[PDB]
Amino acid sequence: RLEEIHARGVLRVGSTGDYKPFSYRAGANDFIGLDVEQAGELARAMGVKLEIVPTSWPTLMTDFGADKFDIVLSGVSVTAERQQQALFSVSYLRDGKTPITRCENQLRFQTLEQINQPAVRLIVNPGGTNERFARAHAPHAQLTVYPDNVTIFGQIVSGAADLMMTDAIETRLQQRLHPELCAVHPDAPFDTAEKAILLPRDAELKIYVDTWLQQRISSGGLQKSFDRWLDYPWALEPLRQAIDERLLLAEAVARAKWNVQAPIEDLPREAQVIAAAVQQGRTLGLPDAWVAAVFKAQIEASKTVQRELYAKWKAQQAGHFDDAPDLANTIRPQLDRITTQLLRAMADNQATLKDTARLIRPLEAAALSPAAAAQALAPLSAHVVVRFL
Amino acid sequence: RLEEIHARGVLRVGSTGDYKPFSYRAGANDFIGLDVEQAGELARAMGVKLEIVPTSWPTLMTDFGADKFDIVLSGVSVTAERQQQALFSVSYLRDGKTPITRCENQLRFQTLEQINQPAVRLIVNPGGTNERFARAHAPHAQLTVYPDNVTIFGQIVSGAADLMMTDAIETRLQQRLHPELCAVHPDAPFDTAEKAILLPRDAELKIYVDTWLQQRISSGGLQKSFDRWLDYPWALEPLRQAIDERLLLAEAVARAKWNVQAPIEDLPREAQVIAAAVQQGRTLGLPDAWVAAVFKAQIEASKTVQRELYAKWKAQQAGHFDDAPDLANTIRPQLDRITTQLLRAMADNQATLKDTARLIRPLEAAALSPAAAAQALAPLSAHVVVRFL
Amino acid sequence: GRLEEIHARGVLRVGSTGDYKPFSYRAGANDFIGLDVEQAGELARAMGVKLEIVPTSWPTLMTDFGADKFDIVLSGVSVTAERQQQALFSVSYLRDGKTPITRCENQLRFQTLEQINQPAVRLIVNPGGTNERFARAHAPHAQLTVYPDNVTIFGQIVSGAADLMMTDAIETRLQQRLHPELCAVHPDAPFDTAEKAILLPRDAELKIYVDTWLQQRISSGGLQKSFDRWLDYPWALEPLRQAIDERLLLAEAVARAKWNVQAPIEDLPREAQVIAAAVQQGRTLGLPDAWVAAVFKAQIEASKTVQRELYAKWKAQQAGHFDDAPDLANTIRPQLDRITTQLLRAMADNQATLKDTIRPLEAAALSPAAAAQALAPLSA
Amino acid sequence: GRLEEIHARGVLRVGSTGDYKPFSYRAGANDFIGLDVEQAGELARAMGVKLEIVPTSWPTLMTDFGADKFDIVLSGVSVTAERQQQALFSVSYLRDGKTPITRCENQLRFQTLEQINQPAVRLIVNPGGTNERFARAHAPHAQLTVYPDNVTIFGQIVSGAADLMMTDAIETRLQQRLHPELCAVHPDAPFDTAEKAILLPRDAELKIYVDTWLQQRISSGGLQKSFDRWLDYPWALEPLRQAIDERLLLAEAVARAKWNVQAPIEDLPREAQVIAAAVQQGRTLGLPDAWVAAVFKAQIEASKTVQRELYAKWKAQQAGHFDDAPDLANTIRPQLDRITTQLLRAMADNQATLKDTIRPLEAAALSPAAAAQALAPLSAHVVV
Ligand SMILES: [Cl-]
Ligand SMILES: [Cl-]
Ligand SMILES: [Cl-]
Ligand SMILES: [Cl-]
Ligand SMILES: [Cl-]
Ligand SMILES: [Cl-]
Ligand code: NA
Ligand code: NA
Ligand code: NA
Ligand code: NA
């Protein structure tokens, strides 16, 4: 197998994309997380390209049998069912299952006895170890099997189920994401399992991966990676998406203004944007001085992109952009939607935004203008956020 | 002393008003809580009126020495400094100090050793046992002293301090109020203290109070009171304040409209109120159908008050109300402020509003119109809140 | 159960340290006395069962609890959080806490925890305790010897071997009476507060039972009464009683030895010497002679009653020679003279206490008549 | 410390149950052997300190840990969450878990947990264990006897007293060799998974030390090697050795008794009868007589060497009469005949195993020469 990879020139890696902090699909061709980073390092070490292949827990082993990928790096628990068809690496992590529920009912679900009874509405994603564990250790409970995820933890928030039981590390993270949810004794889970790399029945590969892993572990490199991706501000990932998406749109804004040969400064639009942001921010209890600064920065950043393009296009004496979207009817609506998103992210994650060596990953739109990207983030640096509050 | 009370005809009771669930000043002449209810029962038993006298922890004993009140019922810990000047009753409760912090950092602050070091930002209210305990058992930490005890737990939510150490029962409550906060091992506090009634140096009174208390305890009456005031929806208390204050203003609205003999229906104002509420609600992620229903009800309730008054005043041939405030300039502004408050309370406490035998205390404005009061609350009954979500 | 498990087993097992007058004192044997032993009694009666005191100590307190060696603990136990981890408590029957005890000269040297907490000062505590925890927390700079017997620990202060101890203010009220040289430091204004309550296991129905019982006792004045009794109780007399007891138990050996040589029981020379020597020694302790003579006459007559009963028994059995019987002149009579000393010193301390004024001696097992004889001149 | 406290104290204290071949077996005495005893050894050497095995058991495992009876535990301990509460673990040196073992006829009767979990079936486990927890969780309906000795528990299945046991697949691979009548049930496909690792105390510097040590051992093939050694190790011979040992230690009593009557050491009648009776009994067990005779000749000659050494010692001391010396005819010789039985049965089981292939007997304390004599005809070459 190891030769087939070297020949094909590419490591195909299964990843569910549903399991923060291991493997998350933020969109696009944009997977992030611990096990995505590791897949990266392994590819580099073999001297080949990486390809993430999407999978899911229900489809995991059938996708393996169809040879859709070479390995799976996705916070996979070593289990015996899986050992039937597959090899595993040495473990890189030790975890296992603990409950997550609304913060009121933490005491209602301390024990498997408390949990295993017909009163209780249990929820799991399908295919999983999470499904197997719920069927084995809580049969009497009422089990809905809910075939989506990231939004499965919504079902508990909204009272539609009572609790879920999942890996204690998933639970530590989801309690940060949903403040209304709480992890149940995650330092003392109900059981133990290894996390390791799913491999095919090929011993030379297993030896390769294991040697690789043991090196990474002993040298501190995995420990480092674990620190990064747990202290990673998963909560700020929407905030980042909003700032990012808004800036990338400045390209379209420029195209449209260019066609009408509008000037870049549009003082009416600036006043409205800021005035409307402040109003919306007051309803969310944000202070106005700060909201204004934030949005001033967003505008100034946009305008830097615009100015760079206008310069370029004046030099070209460029003409008319044919599939440029409408400013009033398409674009400006999108921008106003994002303003909302951005303000809400500011409102929720005021604490998370004061931590300092817990820091966001870099914007896509530094590709477009690194200067503009800096401008946009400037008033969300911890020091100014503390300055305001 | 017991005779001086009977003579004066009034029991003067210290209460800090800062310590849910014992003693809270919701405004006004409006104290509520366990120890306010108890002060009530003691007054009744002596056959006298109750007067709450405001105090605070910093002023507690000086206010006692100035004979500003007879006793103090306010979740007061028995301590030796206080025993110097004062008697105590028998205990009605046994507690003591445990940390509260963001749900992430539960594990960071399990122990006093973990807590007592210069990295950590500790916060306490002044005057207290809480201040004395933090100075004695955690000197190396950074201690900000933040002189308002109701909004102090905001400072932790918002990352401005790391944790607070306070009575484990206060911590049980504040974790319910702020879902993002979590109590640290409140079943296993760092220490123990009695809660009891602060009394003056007079033995006949002490015997009276103690006999009273022992009766209340043995008969189940205190146990009952404890159940009530812990299951009391403290979270919904602002929501209730907003609905209440808004309805009480309908009295002013009627006075003003009466002077101009305006009609009660104003369909423009109705459309604007609802339209503006829905908009604001969208920014808070409330669903619009529900916000509209809620506010329809608030309007219909206002109009019921108006109609009752108009009828009354036609019968009286009442004249002109001289100090009636301006509708456009004074009143309608206030109403719009309260709309904001009300929406935010809806946004936060969607879960709390689905619990059913945890129910709010009755509105002040049932004095004005019980029918209107019913109308206003109707679309915040659990069944309709669940119907919408 | 738990309340049912007790009713079934037919016995209430109660922890008691036996080291903490006036709550719980082990005078020997199966012979516990004090406030909390009396209370354990009343609770047993109320449940309609027998009482069994189970010995414990402060260092072993909670491990003994976890091994289910007893049902409850009644022993002047402070409510503390460590103990609340494993256990329930009753309602408090007392509110107290820690205050210093020191020699009466140095009362003013140790008014405050600042005065106390410094490296000059020699502090002493019994181990296991709240007393140990409090000394470590509130006086770390002082020099701390940990002295593992709580009854004779107050001797160490008297004798200058430590400067002070810090303990429950009620313990301090008592020990200042027992050692006239020691004085309680502001016991009406202790350094802190604690509840005393009954340690219970994690069973709510029992807690409700005990609490209802206790609240009754408190509200009716019955606990207040019990407190008055057991503080005004003449604790001073307990060594005197131990000495009379030990001396009488030796009459068994005396008889064995005399039997082997078939000596007669009455020995008028020995009687005169014993009394004469007691009186002399008593004069040095300022005891009046008439009284010492009476006391020791009684002790002699009591011894002889034991002897006579045994001689009768042994004549009937035709018992032979007792092989491991100690020598009279060389082993036994020395021991008797040692105890005479102890007995006289106990008399000398408690001359006042013996105007005010009892359960049986251990040696009522041997001869109840002799035991009566021995106590007779400590009436009145 | 902790690593410093060990270096200071000069000794590594290691828990071992002594009940779990091939990891940890207590043959007696201060005589532990196995994979994890060998490893404990290597770790001690690496720290530059002496080893002390501290006995423990599964029921007492964690309480003994909390009482600080030892530093670490190396005993084929599964990583479990209960244990993680009080304790750290090393990296795993093995991945295993539970599979059935039963008589070779009933292999097909117990393929699945469904087949196993029902009231017809007589299940057996040792207590304290993961083995007990797993049987209670995954097979409640079965009849569960809890049999508190883990070495002879597999006898109960052989003898039909229970139907099967469920235990670590590696334990099952070994016990099927030891009892030919028993068979492992799909040990390449267990019902579940667990790590084996070293139980450590809450001290991170030590954990780093042990882990670095272990990762080296693993990556270099040294643990794989050690696994091969201790599975191919002739465990069958350990009872045989116990019987030779016990029999020789009795020669001390034999001498005491003969000394009191000043009997001579050589007794050619007794020799002929011992050998004659052993051969007869051996024929019923299908042992060949020539070999049994050799073995027992050696046992006799070895006994006599002990006797001679003691007689010499006692003549020099002019020792007198031994007062609590047992009777020869009535107490001792019976015991010797009981052990002969044991010894022959151990020979009968391990005829194959005695084509392969030792440490000292306990009775080298008594006479090293005699101990050599006793073992001499169980060198391969004499099994001609
Ligand atoms: Cl998994
Ligand atoms: Cl207080
Ligand atoms: Cl405490
Ligand atoms: Cl205590
Ligand atoms: Cl006295
Ligand atoms: Cl195990
Ligand atoms: Na010290
Ligand atoms: Na005194
Ligand atoms: Na053995
Ligand atoms: Na069963």
Numbering used by the authors:
A (entry chain C), B (entry chain D): 21 to 409
C (entry chain A): 20 to 376, 380 to 402
D (entry chain B): 20 to 376, 380 to 406
Q: Can you list sentences taken from the study reporting this PDB entry?
A:
Chorismate mutase (CM) and cyclohexadienyl dehydratase (CDT) catalyze two subsequent reactions in the intracellular biosynthesis of l-phenylalanine (Phe). Here, we report the discovery of novel and extremely rare bifunctional fusion enzymes, consisting of fused CM and CDT domains, which are exported from the cytoplasm. In γ-proteobacterial fusion enzymes, the CM domain is N-terminal to the CDT domain, whereas the order is inverted in β-Proteobacteria. The fusion enzymes of Aequoribacter fuscus, Janthinobacterium sp. HH01, and Duganella sacchari were crystallized and their structures refined to 1.6, 1.7, and 2.4 Å resolution, respectively.
To investigate the relative locations of the active sites within a single polypeptide, ∗AfCMCDT, ∗JbCDTCM, and ∗DsCDTCM were crystallized, and their structures solved and refined to 1.6, 1.7, and 2.4 Å resolution, respectively, and Rfree/Rwork values of 24.8/20.5%, 24.3/19.9%, and 25.8/23.0%. Also the structures of ∗DsCDTCM and ∗JbCDTCM are very similar, both overall and in the active site, with r.m.s.d = 1.4 Å (Cα atoms). ∗JbCDTCM and ∗DsCDTCM share the same residues in both CM and CDT active sites. In the two ∗CDTCMs, the distances between CM and CDT active sites are similarly large, measuring approximately 40 Å, thus disfavoring a direct intramolecular transfer of the metabolic intermediate prephenate from the CM to the CDT active site. Whereas ∗AfCMCDT and ∗JbCDTCM crystals contained only one polypeptide chain in the asymmetric unit, the ∗DsCDTCM crystal contained four chains; with head-to-tail dimers (CM-to-CDT) established by crystallographic symmetry. The buried surface area of this ∗DsCDTCM dimer was estimated to be 3070 Å2, with the free energy of dimer dissociation being 5.8 kcal/mol, as calculated using PDBePISA. The dimerization interface is mainly lined with hydrophilic and charged residues. The crystal structure of ∗DsCDTCM head-to-tail dimers allowed us to address possible intermolecular substrate channeling between domains of different protomers in a protein complex. The active sites of the CM and CDT domains of the two individual chains are separated by a substantial distance of about 40 Å and open toward opposite directions. An ATPase and another solute-binding protein are encoded directly downstream of the genes for ∗TaCMCDT and ∗TvCMCDT, whereas for ∗SbCMCDT and ∗SpCMCDT genes, no flanking coding regions with the same orientation were found. Interestingly, an intramembrane protease and an AI-2E family transporter are encoded by the two genes in the same direction and directly upstream of the one for ∗DsCDTCM, which suggests a role in signal recognition.
